C-alpha cells in the first residue's frame, strides 16, 4: 500500500571480515526492474558502499566490495573486507525503477559491528 | 562546490520546440538522479521530471508526458530538458535539481525563464 | 497523486516570533520521504529539511520538523529577519514528486 525496507538491528561481522543481511521490501504492486544501494551513515555524512540493478527472478549481479542474492521481496546481502574503521550504520536503499510510480524506500539501518 | 548552471531559456512560440541544458560540476553526475521542476510567475513548485542515474529510466508529469523528454550525457556532465508542442501555460521559471542520497532536492540551479507566447 | 495542503496560507508574526507551519497529505508518507524548501523571491529553493527532522548541512538550529503519517509540522523557534520566505513541504517517496502550495511566512506590524 506504501513502499516499507526492514533490515536487521544490528550484525556481528565474522573474522573474516565479511558480513550479511536480509533487506526485504514491501511494495502496493509487483516491481520488476529494482536498484539496491547500500548507504554508510556516519554524523548525517553518507557515502555509497555498493549498487545494483535488478530485474526480479534473474539474479543480482554487482562487485568488489559487495555480493547480493534475490529471493522474492527479499535481498540477501554480504559485504567483505570490513576491517576496523567500517564499523557503522549501512542503509538499505531501494528504489522500483519499473512499472510505475517509482518507489524510494529507505531501510532503518544495520548497526555493522567489526572486530 | 556543488554548482548547477542552467541555459537555454527564452521566447518561443506555442508548438514549437525548445532545449534547456543543466551543466553540473563539483560532485560525481552520473552518481546521482535528477529533475526539472518548474514554477509559473508567482505560483508555486511544481515537478516536471525524473531520469535515473544513467538515464534507463524517465518519470514525467501529466501535464507534460508525450510532450518533453528528459535526457543526460554523464560524459559531458550535463542535464537536458527537451520541450516538445509547447504551450502557453508551460511558461514558467525551470530549475535543475539534483535528489540526495536520501531522497529531498539537496542541490538546485539558479533557473531559466521560458516564455511561450506569439 | 499524494496531495499537499499547507497551512496557513500567509502566516503573520513579528520578528523574534516562534512560526509553527503545517502540511497535511492526503495518504500516508512515510517520515523518510518529507522535505521542507524555503524559497526568498527571486531565488531558487532551498532545501531545509529532510526525512521530516534531519536539517540540511548549514540549516541553523531554529528550524525543526516534526510529524508522521499524514500530518507533519515545520517550526521556527525564533523568526530572524532572513527567515520571512515561502515555505514548501514535498513529499519524494515516490511518482510523481508532489509540492504543497506554500506558506508565505510576512512581517506584521
Known amino acids: 500500500k506504501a513502499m516499507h525496507v526492514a533490515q536487521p538491528a544490528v550484525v556481528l561481522a565474522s573474522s573474516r571480515g565479511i558480513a550479511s543481511f536480509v533487506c526485504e521490501y514491501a511494495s502496493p504492486g509487483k516491481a520488476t526492474e529494482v536498484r539496491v544501494t547500500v548507504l554508510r551513515q556516519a554524523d548525517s555524512q553518507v557515502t555509497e558502499v555498493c549498487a545494483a540493478t535488478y530485474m526480479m527472478g534473474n539474479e543480482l549481479t554487482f562487485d568488489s566490495i559487495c555480493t547480493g542474492t534475490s529471493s522474492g521481496n527479499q535481498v540477501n546481502l554480504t559485504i567483505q573486507g570490513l576491517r576496523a574503521m567500517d564499523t557503522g550504520l549501512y542503509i538499505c536503499k531501494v528504489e522500483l525503477m519499473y512499472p510505475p510510480p517509482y518507489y524510494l524506500g529507505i531501510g532503518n539501518g544495520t548497526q555493522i559491528y567489526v572486530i | 562546490q556543488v554548482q548547477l548552471v542552467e541555459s537555454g531559456g527564452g521566447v518561443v512560440q506555442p508548438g514549437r520546440s525548445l532545449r534547456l541544458s543543466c551543466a553540473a560540476s563539483?560532485?560525481?553526475?552520473?552518481?546521482?538522479?535528477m529533475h526539472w521542476v518548474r514554477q509559473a510567475p508567482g505560483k508555486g513548485l511544481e515537478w516536471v521530471t525524473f531520469?535515473?542515474?544513467?538515464?534507463?529510466?524517465?518519470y514525467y508529469a501529466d501535464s507534460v508526458k508525450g510532450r518533453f523528454t528528459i535526457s543526460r550525457d554523464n560524459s559531458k556532465n550535463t542535464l537536458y530538458l527537451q520541450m516538445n508542442s509547447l504551450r502557453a501555460e508551460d511558461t514558467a521559471i525551470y530549475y535543475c535539481?539534483?535528489?540526495?542520497?536520501?531522497?529531498?532536492?539537496?542541490?538546485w540551479g539558479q533557473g531559466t525563464l521560458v516564455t511561450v507566447s506569439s | 497523486e499524494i496531495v499537499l495542503t499547507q497551512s496557513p496560507g500567509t502566516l503573520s508574526l513579528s520578528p523574534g516570533e516562534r512560526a509553527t507551519l503545517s502540511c497535511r497529505a492526503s495518504?500516508?508518507?512515510?517520515?523518510?520521504?518529507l522535505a521542507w524548501y524555503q524559497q526568498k523571491p527571486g531565488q531558487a529553493p532551498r532545501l531545509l529539511i529532510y526525512?521530516?527532522?534531519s536539517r540540511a548541512t548549514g540549516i541553523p538550529d531554529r528550524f525543526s520538523g516534526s510529524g508522521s503519517g499524514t500530518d507533519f509540522t515545520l517550526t521556527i523557534s525564533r523568526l530572524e529577519p532572513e527567515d520571512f520566505a515561502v515555505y514548501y513541504c514535498?513529499?519524494?517517496?515516490?511518482?510523481?514528486?508532489?509540492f504543497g502550495q506554500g506558506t508565505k511566512v510576512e512581517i506584521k506590524r
Open positions: 495518504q500516508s508518507v512515510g517520515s523518510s520521504y
Open positions: 514535498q513529499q519524494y517517496g515516490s511518482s510523481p514528486w508532489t
Open positions: 526525512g521530516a527532522f
Open positions: 531520469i535515473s542515474y544513467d538515464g534507463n529510466n524517465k
Open positions: 563539483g560532485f560525481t553526475f552520473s552518481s546521482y538522479t
Open positions: 535539481a539534483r535528489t540526495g542520497w536520501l531522497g529531498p532536492f539537496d542541490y
